[PDB]
Design a protein around this ligand. Sequence first.
Ligand SMILES: Nc1ncnc2c1ncn2[C@@H]1O[C@H](COP(=O)(O)OP(=O)(O)OP(=O)(O)O)[C@@H](O)[C@H]1O
Ligand SMILES: Nc1ncnc2c1ncn2[C@@H]1O[C@H](COP(=O)(O)OP(=O)(O)OP(=O)(O)O)[C@@H](O)[C@H]1O
Ligand SMILES: [Mg+2]
Ligand SMILES: [Mg+2]
Lengths: 140, 526, 170, 50, 487, 112
Amino acid sequence: YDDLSKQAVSYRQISLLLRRPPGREAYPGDVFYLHSRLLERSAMMSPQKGSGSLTSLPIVETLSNDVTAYIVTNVISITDGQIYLDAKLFTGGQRPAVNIGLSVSRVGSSAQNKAMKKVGGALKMLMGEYRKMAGEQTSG
Amino acid sequence: KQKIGFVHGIDGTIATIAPAASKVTVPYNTVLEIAVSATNIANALVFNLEKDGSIGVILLDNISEVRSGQDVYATGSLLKIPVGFHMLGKIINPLGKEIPTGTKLGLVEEMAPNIVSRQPVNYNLLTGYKVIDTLIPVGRGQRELILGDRQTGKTSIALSTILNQTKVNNEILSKNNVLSVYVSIGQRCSNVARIHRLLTEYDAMKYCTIVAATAADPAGLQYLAPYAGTTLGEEFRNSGRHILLVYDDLSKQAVSYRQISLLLRRPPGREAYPGDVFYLHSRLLERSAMMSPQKGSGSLTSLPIVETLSNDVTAYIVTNVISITDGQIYLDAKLFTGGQRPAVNIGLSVSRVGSSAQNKAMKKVGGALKMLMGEYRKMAGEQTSGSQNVSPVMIRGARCLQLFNQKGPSYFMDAIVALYAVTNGYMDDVKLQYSKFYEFLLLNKDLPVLYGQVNNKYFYMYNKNLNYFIRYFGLNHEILEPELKKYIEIHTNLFLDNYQSRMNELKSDEDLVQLKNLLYACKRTV
Amino acid sequence: AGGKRYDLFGYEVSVATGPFIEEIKKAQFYDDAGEVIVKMNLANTPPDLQTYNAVLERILNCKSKRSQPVKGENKFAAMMDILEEMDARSGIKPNAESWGYVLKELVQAGDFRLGWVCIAGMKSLGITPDQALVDANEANAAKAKAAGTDFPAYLKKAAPESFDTKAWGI
Amino acid sequence: GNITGLMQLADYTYNKTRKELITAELLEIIGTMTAMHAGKKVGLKKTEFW
Amino acid sequence: DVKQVGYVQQIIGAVVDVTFTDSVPPVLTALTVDAKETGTLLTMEIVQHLDTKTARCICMSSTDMLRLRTPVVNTGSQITVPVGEATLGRIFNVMGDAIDQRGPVKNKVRWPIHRKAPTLAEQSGKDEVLVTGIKVIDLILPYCKGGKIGLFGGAGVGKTVIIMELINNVAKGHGGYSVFAGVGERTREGTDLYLEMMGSKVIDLQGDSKCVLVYGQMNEPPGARARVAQTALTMAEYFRDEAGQDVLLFVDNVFRFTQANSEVSALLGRIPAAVGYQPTLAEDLGMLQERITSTVKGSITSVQAVYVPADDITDPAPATTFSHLDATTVLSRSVAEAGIYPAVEPLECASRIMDPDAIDVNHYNVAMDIVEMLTKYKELQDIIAVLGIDELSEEDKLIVDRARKVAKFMSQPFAVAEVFTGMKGYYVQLEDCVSDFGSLLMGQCDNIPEMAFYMVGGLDSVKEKAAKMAAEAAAMRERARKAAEAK
Amino acid sequence: DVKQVGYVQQIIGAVVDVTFTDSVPPVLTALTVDAKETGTLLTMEIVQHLDTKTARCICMSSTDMLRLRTPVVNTGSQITVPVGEATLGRIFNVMGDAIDQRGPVKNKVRWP
Ligand SMILES: Nc1ncnc2c1ncn2[C@@H]1O[C@H](COP(=O)(O)OP(=O)(O)OP(=O)(O)O)[C@@H](O)[C@H]1O
Ligand SMILES: Nc1ncnc2c1ncn2[C@@H]1O[C@H](COP(=O)(O)OP(=O)(O)OP(=O)(O)O)[C@@H](O)[C@H]1O
Ligand SMILES: [Mg+2]
Ligand SMILES: [Mg+2]
């Protein structure tokens, strides 16, 4: 789902022209229930239902690297994890500009592979330790 | 006569009219005459005609004396006001009523001239201040904004600009005069009276007029006053003449229209404003223009004033008006508190058009001082007290900011010759505090004529008709340059010998206090 | 008048100026001649050098700017602001006749140091002055030098050796 | 001196953002009240006209 | 046939309601009243329906002296404006009427102002760099032929000057018909542009003109500011489709188009969104933007300016406008206050063609390293503003002394701003633009001081200015030596 | 000559609306209702006309125990306050009713 902010501006346009009452940031208020209806339909189906699936990677634009906007918080509330891309790091060289401090995944080892469990469990420790030291301009 | 209807209801400035039984058509943006009393008649403007026959109206007069059962009459014409030469030398209600002290009707709402009716400005406009006439020039037609915090010297620049024109307009023909108008939106009636008395004292009133919309006046009338001043200006614009116009201030015009909007429950926007305050100001400031020779080559220059908050040009109204005006003059409260007056910041100030209008004699001096101050701004900040330096840049800068320290309007001839010395290094040996006395002794007094040295042929100061030669040939011409250098070298030598010696020799406290008294007096009179 | 003049925008103008020059010459107050020029630019009949010279003649010959007097009026600042209008606004440059009227004005007004500036300006522009006028200029200069009227008196008044706001006249 | 120069700007932008967020919440509330006024209907106003 | 007639019902601002007896025409149909009553001609497009036997409609000219029982006439079509070669070298109003007082436009056909955008099958995005000669615009955000450009900047930052420099570089040597939409900007600027072009023979009336001008300025009402952009897009889409020719589209600017639509929605009574913009902002902006595309028939190279009130990027109108463009150029105020001009913020700016597939690898890697160096300089500003350069590591202060050099070199003078900087304008070629940054990046030129990079073009001009400054400084030292010996 | 009388029609906080049968008085005109109803004297100044016979009036005291459609006397003018030498050494509220308990005030004239 390419930008859902433009689908929230569209839903606001619809509701306001249909003379619904506004709310926070002029949204009608139930845009949380809107994206909830959209995103809770994602699931890993039971083997009784074929063991099918549908993954979802919605995208939301951000303004000045804030996670305090209405729709942003309403979608972080819904989605499991998040891939936060920091403009300070895109501009600072690294690509993909993933910010690991703000990007997590609420599934973990159960999703990834047997060969990836043993590597990810080492890289999590390694990056947690490098996060504490990498602030130092390398002297030694 | 007409009896179109009657006042249904009132909410402060805004009102609503209900039609009569025999409903009759009334046009749009028309003035209505409300029969307040047996003789008194209010005045109020239509702004919307509704389905039910109801009419929204903005009231302008006798709002305390309007009621509901009163009748309403229609004029069938736009909101108009008188205009002409007879209106000069008077202070008026924006509705034409004269305010006492101790035929041709023009339309208040009108479209601006198109690009073909307009022209790039060609002749300058002297504000009497050396910062402006040197580095931030002003053409006849170039509208320019004045920014700064409260009580900073914004109104005083306009007043000194008006007072400067009186010395010239009497001399030159009347076609090349600059008449003037001063609208005061929300200002105190006391200050308006003091301005009236000032112009009356200096006799600038014959070439000026004032529009008074005080803070106690209604919001529709404060909204209407600048349109009325511009309407008085457009007659002299379209009649070939030149004319100045001032707005004190647009921020309070926007506040009055904000009152009217919020009382009409119009949807607000950024900083409480409706959203059409940009159109509101563009209607006003596009009526300023340098007309084309196809239309008479007249003019309407506009110097609006706008109040900042804590030195913040990022305000919505401030940037809306910078998005309209042809320039910017920024007065700083930091400098106004730090003695420099006028407190113009040359970095944040600019004149986008006035280079074409600046006379070459003043263009070259302005170029030299612009480069000098571009260097001074950098050499003054890079050291940040790390180590002082003795250099001609910092020297001439400190000797020039003292000349920029001013109190009233200066003559153009006086404005140049003080700056020429700084640009060419003649004002390097003299001290900080004796620059205003040096200037006063250069211009009003004449040391060569005093001390007998009359080797100079023509170049002196007592006449002041040499201005119109310097302004046409330029000081760097071959005939004016040597006499100029000789007069200045003599003045420097006589100053350094006679005066500065005695000054540095003065040690008595009463003498030094009397001398600081003299230097402050010279700072005022210069 | 085979030549055709044009505006900055490229539009056409009309050189037919005679009926306006006649209204200038018939005037007896030299501000009405500028009122004529105001009524003349509106007719898209921009002025010519032959019109500016009529204006200078009219300023020189008229007794006053207006039926009622005016404080600070100079017949020179008009006759030189109109030449700044000539050179800067309109591009035209004055001629020997124009500077001739200017020099006659300075001779009538009695100023001689500025008359000498006008002489040196003529010579810098290749214009030849009138010897009948430069002789009167040097005569007035000699008279003022003899009678001490070459400068005012308040300049030659001895300055206060002691510093005082009321002694310096401020 | 530098810390003070930053502190005044920080206080200024802090109060700016405070006042703008207050104005914004106000205009939200007034927008909602206005939308509700639009949602409510007009009555009949039946009376003798003769 | 007979023309339909309707009668006015109510007036609230520029918005008007009209009662049509028989039936109501479709939306966007134009409706004309004779100039006998109002005094001037007045065409009025339908925008929405309220109920049957009623239509709401916006006016173009002013509603002054408009009454409640005036006969309105159905034209039977949208607002049509002329097209063809007769529209070349001519200035146009919102209605398509010429205002330059020259003569009657010799049109053959008139097209409506509202039009559906091209289809995805018709669209063809070819990526080709547009060498402007401006040095920040080349390195950081290289423009694309047939693409879109956005100059996002407040009042007094230099977007109009960037526009003038781009016109003087591209349009004169473009060989294709250009269009210039003035939408709520200075009539001063429109006058100066018309005169700069009648003097550069771009609007040569006795010959071939390569330009079309359309001007609804700030004096004009919002009904015009809201419908002058469409008239310019009509003029440009005719040359894109019919002529099948590449064109340029300079719009100055769309933020006042947005303001006009907001000022209109206020009169219409629609419930507003956040900070006070119109609810239909995203739709109106997409209907404007997606018409500007490069099909198989031709190409439109747009340059839209945008205004940012109170210097706010989080403003929803620019925030939406970023996603619709190919090259964003975000200007700043603190950069202009710091003497740098053009006041570009390369850290906030961005481009789409900035990939090695389109631009060469060296230009890519250099721009990436410059942006990284400046991101580090920005992170070190938080220290430098507080403590000083003396409290930084040697590596850190070297990065600072080099990023300052890059920032001063990014400044340069333009031929348009010669009045202000007092210097002639330079035209830096791309190959000489890349080698200079590469030398300043690899430390190939560090002996040169910081100020030799301020307001110059080309490393040759740098070394000239550095020689000049060394000469002047030495002459000042001999001068002070002689003044001391004589003293 | 007689004096005008109106009738209350709604009370919302300090705001009160007063229907009349004649020309509505001007704005800021004072409207008094006797102290027998509320328990204390009560004055309300007209602020905002709603129609040809309604008059919104802001209230300066507590409007508690004020019934509906009570009679309300128009003062004929706005709030007349005392003025003079007798005013000195005293305290007065907005309506000029002394609250310092120190007897009446012996004034000659009473200005709006
Ligand atoms: N150049 C100056 N030199 C000395 N004093 C000045 C100067 N300019 C202004 N002042 C003084 O500042 C005070 C206020 O000036 P002014 O009336 O110009 O303020 P303002 O810009 O109109 O602000 P406001 O209109 O909000 O009062 C006056 O006492 C005036 O004498
Ligand atoms: N390259 C430049 N060199 C020198 N000065 C510049 C340059 N660009 C802009 N300026 C200055 O910035 C000021 C405003 O320029 P400009 O007319 O472009 O404003 P703008 O960007 O058009 O904003 P607005 O359209 O709101 O006026 C002027 O004083 C101009 O001289
Ligand atoms: Mg003031
Ligand atoms: Mg501009």
